[PDB]
Amino acid sequence: RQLVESGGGLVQPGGSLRLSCAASGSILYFNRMGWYRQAPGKQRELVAAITSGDSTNYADPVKGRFTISRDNAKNTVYLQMNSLKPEDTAVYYCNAKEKGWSFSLYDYWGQGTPVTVVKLVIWINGDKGYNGLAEVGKKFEKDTGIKVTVEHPDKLEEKFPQVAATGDGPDIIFWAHDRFGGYAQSGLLAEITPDKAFQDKLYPFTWDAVRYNGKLIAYPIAVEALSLIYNKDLLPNPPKTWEEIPALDKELKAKGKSALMFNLQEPYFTWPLIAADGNAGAKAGLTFLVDLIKNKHMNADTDYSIAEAAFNKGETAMTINGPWAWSNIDTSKVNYGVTVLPTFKGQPSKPFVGVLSAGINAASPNKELAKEFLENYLLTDEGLEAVNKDKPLGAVALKSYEEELAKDPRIAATMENAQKGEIMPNIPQMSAFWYAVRTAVINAASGRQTVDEALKDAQT
Numbered sequence: 179r180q181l182v183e184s185g186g187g188l189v190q191p192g193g194s195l196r197l198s199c200a201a202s203g204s205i206l207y208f209n210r211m212g213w214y215r216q217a218p219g220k221q222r223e224l225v226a227a228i229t230s231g232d233s234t235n236y237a238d239p240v241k242g243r244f245t246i247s248r249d250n251a252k253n254t255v256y257l258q259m260n261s262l263k264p265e266d267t268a269v270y271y272c273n274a275k276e277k278g279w280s281f282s283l284y285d286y287w288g289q290g291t292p293v294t295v296v297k298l299v300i301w302i303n304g305d306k307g308y309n310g311l312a313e314v315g316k317k318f319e320k321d322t323g324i325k326v327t328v329e330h331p332d333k334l335e336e337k338f339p340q341v342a343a344t345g346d347g348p349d350i351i352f353w354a355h356d357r358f359g360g361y362a363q364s365g366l367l368a369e370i371t372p373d374k375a376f377q378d379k380l381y382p383f384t385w386d387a388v389r390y391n392g393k394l395i396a397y398p399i400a401v402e403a404l405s406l407i408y409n410k411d412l413l414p415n416p417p418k419t420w421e422e423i424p425a426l427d428k429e430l431k432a433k434g435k436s437a438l439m440f441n442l443q444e445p446y447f448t449w450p451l452i453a454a455d456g457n458a459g460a461k462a463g464l465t466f467l468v469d470l471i472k473n474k475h476m477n478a479d480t481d482y483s484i485a486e487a488a489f490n491k492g493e494t495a496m497t498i499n500g501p502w503a504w505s506n507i508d509t510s511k512v513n514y515g516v517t518v519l520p521t522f523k524g525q526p527s528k529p530f531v532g533v534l535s536a537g538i539n540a541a542s543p544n545k546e547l548a549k550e551f552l553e554n555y556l557l558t559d560e561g562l563e564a565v566n567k568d569k570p571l572g573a574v575a576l577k578s579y580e581e582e583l584a585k586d587p588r589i590a591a592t593m594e595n596a597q598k599g600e601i602m603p604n605i606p607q608m609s610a611f612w613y614a615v616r617t618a619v620i621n622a623a624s625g626r627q628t629v630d631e632a633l634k635d636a637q638t
């Protein structure tokens with residue numbers, strides 16, 4: 179009597195698989211038939227069993243999800259595995275017990291059938307082109323069989339280092355390079371090892387942004403910089419200086435329109451004005467921002483959504499945003515322009531420059547599968563095109579995309595602001611820094627702490 183298992187393959191969590199174990203003898207003679215699993219480096223774990231008496235038992239993990247069935251005609255025991263999970267992943271073995279005639283019994287085993295539950299999970303921000311990133315992921319599943327789900331959870335920059343440390347979290351994490359040094363110091367990211375030929379496809383300056391202590395900690399995707407987005411119909415010759423916005427606002431408020439609406443909550447949007455001169459520069463830049471809210475030119479709790487919506491609706495003449503925001507404007511019927519950020523105290527407003535980068539989670543089993551996705555499928559002409567047609571990436575890191583980038587007037591304006599700004603250091607202290615600026619700007623905006631007292635608490 180020999181037991182032969184079948185139906186073992188790769189599947190997506192939530193999917194299904196029917197294991198079948200056929201014997202070379204009648205199942206009637208068997209007392210008990212059942213399924214055991216063995217994951218790498220672990221003990222035998224019974225999942226299900228069926229006795230000659232038709233009673234079926236299951237282990238608590240698989241209970242409710244798996245059903246053990248039997249067909250005495252086909253001389254086969256089945257395991258219908260529904261709603262699969264990564265914890266299920268193991269080698270599944272078929273077992274049969276037979277009482278002899280005398281007191282003793284016989285245990286019979288099979289070859290084993292491998293079941294792999296694999297899901298490629300990607301964490302990217304909701305303001306980016308996750309739908310397009312999914313279209314790349316859909317082509318990956320066609321050529322391999324691995325599922326590529328794209329998730330966009332709130333506060334992922336500070337949810338990733340908590341979840342990825344303890345739990346599983348994502349396989350690959352997408353965020354501007356500045357947050358990655360903190361992940362690298364903490365040991366939350368795998369070292370990137372790309373071959374020369376892949377390495378050569380991207381601009382050498384882009385690789386520098388994704389380097390911490392002489393180790394590549396991510397894959398560079400695109401350079402991001404804030405620009406001044408303006409409605410050409412409401413404002414044909416927009417302000418070249420910050421100091422002439424109050425005058426323009428007085429003019430526009432008479433006609434039931436705002437001058438400038440942008441995200442005041444997130445400090446990345448307010449930093450260019452703050453850092454225009456520089457300290458004395460931070461005091462100057464912020465006082466101006468405070469005076470705008472004090473003169474009722476800007477709203478106190480202006481966030482990403484009400485600013486975006488207001489510009490797209492045609493209520494505000496200007497807004498401060500990144501490449502990613504353009505597609506939503508195109509959807510609306512607004513003749514828009516992207517240009518240089520306004521100057522403050524003569525000198526330019528220095529926006530921080532981000533390099534969108536993809537890193538592999540140190541606690542991921544799919545490190546080689548993610549490297550394949552990132553190199554051969556995402557960081558390709560075809561791959562970046564898909565992401566870019568959803569929501570624009572900005573100035574891509576791919577060398578082959580220079581011609582297409584250069585043909586776009588908005589990219590030109592983005593690069594103009596990126597040169598006037600500076601790339602963020604990747605250092606672990608960036609997190610504490612950003613938090614210090616986030617509070618400082620909110621406190622001064624609402625009317626709690628003074629501009630002098632804001633820089634005091636922030637420098638500490």
Ligand SMILES: OC[C@H]1O[C@H](O[C@H]2[C@H](O)[C@@H](O)[C@@H](O)O[C@@H]2CO)[C@H](O)[C@@H](O)[C@@H]1O
Binds near residue numbers: 353354402612
């Ligand atoms: O607001 C501070 C925040 O700014 C930057 O995050 C940007 C991100 O880089 C952009 O891609 C865009 O989506 O908006 C974010 C701000 O809303 C820094 O990268 C980040 O560390 C910092 O927390």
